[PDB]
RNA sequence: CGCCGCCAAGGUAUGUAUCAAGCUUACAAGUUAUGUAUUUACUGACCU
RNA sequence: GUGCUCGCUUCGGCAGCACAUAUACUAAAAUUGGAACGAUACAGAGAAGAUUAGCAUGGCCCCUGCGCAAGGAUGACACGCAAAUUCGUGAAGCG
């Protein structure tokens, strides 16, 4: 797609 | 600047022999596009065939999934322009020499040193394929690509060798129909050929043929799969499935959506791994 | 020959400015004036690559990143705008203006929870007071009671400023917070200022307690005087404390 | 008791738009004014 | 193809043994893009007056030279961007 894929771990916070 | 171990080599340039001998070099010829020192390899495909050493380098073949020496695709056996016209994304590359060409070429070689297994941009869009390009996908191709080019002194009648001249003879070429993107002269006629195929002659009335005789059901086609494949086209008025002939009857309100189904199912609608049988319904209350 | 003169003018300007950026690869005015000259054409797919290869020689400057971000914000493309804003703010965390203008673009956008994720990342880098009370004003301008209370517990443990000690007692002047106002006043009395009072907290404490009834207003100003600073007060406010106690009571004979 | 044997760059500039041979793959292929001390300019085809 | 062995029954026919797959395939090309130099015509020659020794910095400019010497007009190309001093607009916040 145009936007990149959102990487969030299983338990914690949103990863950048 | 470039070393290699083994090139791409689609099957129509390998020859008819699984046993070929090949010699290699460390720094051979320049590419005819970007002049990069690849490794030219030389082999003999057949006993009546020329050598067909190497046309381009490895890196420019790794951009667009192109074979090594005749500049066709590896995944089908088609040119590049048909492939990115059928997929509608070109993956642009410059034309000049030092403007932006070797810059992005060296950078795309630099970012592709890890994989060496898949192209840089075609990995995501070579999956949604086999719909429009499977119709012209030639199996067991003609070996006339491998035959040597035409020699002189038979055109003028001076050839002292006679039969032992290895190239060709008695082939008058034609100066009416013979690079990387465009333009290719017989390929335009090939697109006209795939645009001028042989469908059924359209009968001259106002879209009254809303029924259609599709069959070849067996045990793969079911009623809910067919009505959901018709649901993306539109809504039904009266559908049925008959099992004494393994067939299905569908109609539409204002014909046009089913019309592109007539574009979709002229021995072309391939679901559940079968070439379905389609001929015309009555639309006459007969 | 209108197209010939048009392409000749554009090609001469592009060639001159590409020779200018080829000569000097340090000063960044040339790339941004060239790219805003292409932005004047209003239809570009090449100026993003110009800003992208212009940050490779200098990514530590604020001006190029903010100008390309405001250029992409000026156009209607928001997805590529977010795709350059997030890498800008994760590249330079310590600057404030990128986060400010991205959150202001989100002020122009909706109030979705991704904005709150941006604001909690903006809390995570430990900025100064100017960011944090701006974010609590952001929480006030959408009328949030529970979440603004939630984000404000981590506020005091970083900055022990008296301007923040008196404004940790703000739910008194917002919700009146009674039992937890007594708990917040316990928090105002047990922490730093154990023997010197920081000469300002008990003023606002007695101010709100005079705004309240006569529960515990006699104890703090005159009877809790163990924590004095050599006179318990300057000359400027002691009689003001006395008249602050006098004429705002039950007024018995 | 008998050294030593000399070339060149340093100077008659070089940046352009057309017109062949040299070399290169032979391949991918379907405020006027006066008097004077005093310069600066101007004229007479002024003059050995 | 060639030599040897009656080895099998005619010197001749047969059989076995040994030798074991080269070539940028062309004398050509319908040919291919044709850059240097020379010729034509322009523009013309560093350093705030004139003639000018030069040595340098850069990279998408090269040449002569065996060059980690050197010389090519200092080998050529190097230009207006004032930044914060005054004022206007907009945003974030505080009393
Ligand atoms: Mg020099
Ligand atoms: Mg110089
Ligand atoms: Zn190449
Ligand atoms: Zn091939
Ligand atoms: Zn011949």
How is B41-92 classified by DSSP, letter by letter? Answer: EEE---TTS------S-SHHHHHHTB-SSS--BSSSS--HHHHHHHS-----
Residue B278 in contact with residue B267, Cβ under 8 Å?
yes
B151 touches strand E (CB under 7 A): yes
Nearest alpha carbon to residue B135 among B202, B191, B182, B203: B191
Order across the sheet with B277-280: list the strands.
B240-242, B247-249, B212-215, B277-280
CB contact under 8 A, C79 and A14: no
B192 touches strand E (CB under 7 A): no
Residue C157 in contact with residue C151, Cβ under 8 Å?
no
Judged on CB neighbours under 10 Å (0-12, 13-18, 19+), B8 is middle
Q: Give the H or E element holding residue C181.
A: helix C178-190
Residue C118 in contact with residue C102, Cβ under 8 Å?
yes
**A7 and C CB contact within 8 Å:** no
Distance B30 CA to ligand 3 centre (A): 8
C→A interface, C-beta within 8 Å: 79-80, 82-83, 86, 90, 117, 121
User: Which residues in chain C have their CB less than 8 angstroms from residue A15's CB?
Assistant: none
Q: Determine the Cα–Cα distance for residues B226 and B261; give it in Å rounded to an integer.
A: 12
Which protein residues, judged by their CB atom, are less than 7 Å from any atom of strand D?
A: B 13, 29, 32, 50-53, 55, 69-71, 138, 142, 144-145, 149, 173, 177-178, 186, 190
Buried b (16+ CB within 10 A) or exposed e, C91-113: ebeeebebbebbbebbeeeeeee
SS3 of residue B24 by DSSP? strand
> Which nucleotide's C1' is closest to B187 (Cα)?
D30
SS3 of residue C249 by DSSP? coil
Distance C22 CA to ligand 2 centre (A): 18
Q: What's the CA B100/C1' D14 distance, rounded, in angstroms?
A: 30
Q: Which residue of C has its CA nearest to A4?
A: C83
| Least distant ligand from the CA of B1 | 3
Distance B99 CA to ligand 2 centre (A): 26
Q: Determine the Cα–Cα distance for residues C122 and C132; give it in Å rounded to an integer.
A: 9
* CB under 5 Å of ion ligand 4: residues: B 10, 13, 67, 69-70
User: How far is it between the farthest Cα atoms of chain B?
Assistant: 78
- Domain holding C16, by residue range, is 1-253
Measured CA to CA in angstroms, residue C148 lies from C139, C140, C157 at distances of: 6, 8, 16
SS3 of residue B185 by DSSP? helix
Pick left, alpha or beta for residue B170 (phi over 0 → left; psi -120 to 50 → alpha; otherwise beta): left
Q: Determine the Cα–Cα distance for residues C4 and C2; give it in Å rounded to an integer.
A: 5
CB contact under 8 A, A16 and C90: yes
Distance B31 CA to ligand 5 centre (A): 30
Q: State the method.
A: cryo-EM
Q: Determine the Cα–Cα distance for residues C124 and C116; give it in Å rounded to an integer.
A: 12
Give B238's Cβ-side CA count (13 Å radius): 2
Nucleotides of D under 7 A from a protein CB: 25, 27-30
Number of domains in chain C: 1
């Amino acid at each position: 797609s145009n936007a990149l894929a959102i990487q969030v771990d299983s338990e914690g916070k949103i990863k950048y | 600047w470039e070393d290699a171990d083994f090139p791409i080599l689609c099957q129509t340039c390998l020859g008819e022999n699984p046993y070929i001998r090949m010699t290699k070099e460390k720094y051979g010829k320049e590419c005819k596009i970007c002049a990069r020192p690849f490794t030219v390899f030389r082999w003999c495909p057949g006993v009546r065939m020329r050598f067909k050493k190497t046309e381009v380098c490895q890196t420019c073949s790794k951009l667009k999934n192109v074979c090594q020496t005749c500049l066709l695709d590896l995944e089908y056996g088609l040119p590049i322009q048909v492939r990115d016209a059928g997929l509608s994304f070109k993956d642009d590359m410059p034309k000049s020499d030092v403007n932006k060409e070797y810059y992005t070429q060296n950078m795309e070689r630099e970012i592709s040193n890890s994989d060496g297994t898949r192209p840089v941009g075609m990995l995501g869009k070579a999956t949604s394929t086999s719909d429009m390009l499977l119709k012209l996908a030639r199996t067991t191709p003609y070996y006339k690509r491998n035959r040597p080019h035409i020699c002189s002194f038979w055109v003028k009648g001076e050839c002292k060798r006679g039969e032992e001249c290895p190239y060709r003879h008695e082939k008058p070429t034609d100066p009416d129909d013979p690079r990387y993107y465009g333009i290719n002269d017989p390929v335009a006629d090939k697109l006209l050929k795939r645009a001028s195929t042989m469908p059924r002659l359209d009968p001259p009335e106002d879209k009254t043929i809303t029924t259609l005789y599709v069959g070849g059901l067996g045990d793969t086609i079911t009623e809910t799969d067919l009505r959901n494949h018709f649901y993306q086209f539109g809504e039904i008025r009266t559908i049925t499935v008959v099992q004494r002939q393994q067939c299905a009857f569908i109609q539409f309100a204002t014909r046009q959506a089913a019309e592109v189904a007539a574009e979709k199912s002229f021995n072309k609608l391939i679901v559940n791994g079968r070439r379905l049988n389609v001929k015309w319904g009555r639309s006459q209350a007969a | 020959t209108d197209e010939e003169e048009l392409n000749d003018y554009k090609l001469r300007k592009r060639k001159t400015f590409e020779d200018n950026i080829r000569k000097n690869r340090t000063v960044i005015s040339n790339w941004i004036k060239y790219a805003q000259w292409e932005e004047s054409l209003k239809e570009i797919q090449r100026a993003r690559s110009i800003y992208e290869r212009a940050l490779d020689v200098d990514y530590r400057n604020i001006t190029l990143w903010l100008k390309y971000a405001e250029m992409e914000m000026k156009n209607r493309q928001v997805n590529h705008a977010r795709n350059i804003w997030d890498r800008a703010i994760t590249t330079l965390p310590r600057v404030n203006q990128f986060w400010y203008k991205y959150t202001y673009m989100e002020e122009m956008l909706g109030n979705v929870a991704g904005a709150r994720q941006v604001f909690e990342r903006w809390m995570e880098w430990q900025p100064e007071e100017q960011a944090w009370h701006s974010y609590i004003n952001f929480e006030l301008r959408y009328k949030e009671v529970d979440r603004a209370r939630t984000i404000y517990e981590r506020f005091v443990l970083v900055h022990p400023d008296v301007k923040n000690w008196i404004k940790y007692a703000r739910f008194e002047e917002k919700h009146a917070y009674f039992a937890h106002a007594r708990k917040v006043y316990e928090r105002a009395v047990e922490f730093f200022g154990d023997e010197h009072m920081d000469e300002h907290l008990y003023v606002a404490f007695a101010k709100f307690e005079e705004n309240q009834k006569e529960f515990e207003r006699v104890r703090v100003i005159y009877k809790y005087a163990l924590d004095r600073i050599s006179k318990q007060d300057a000359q400027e406010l002691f009689k003001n404390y006395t008249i602050f106690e006098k004429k705002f009571g039950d007024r018995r004979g």
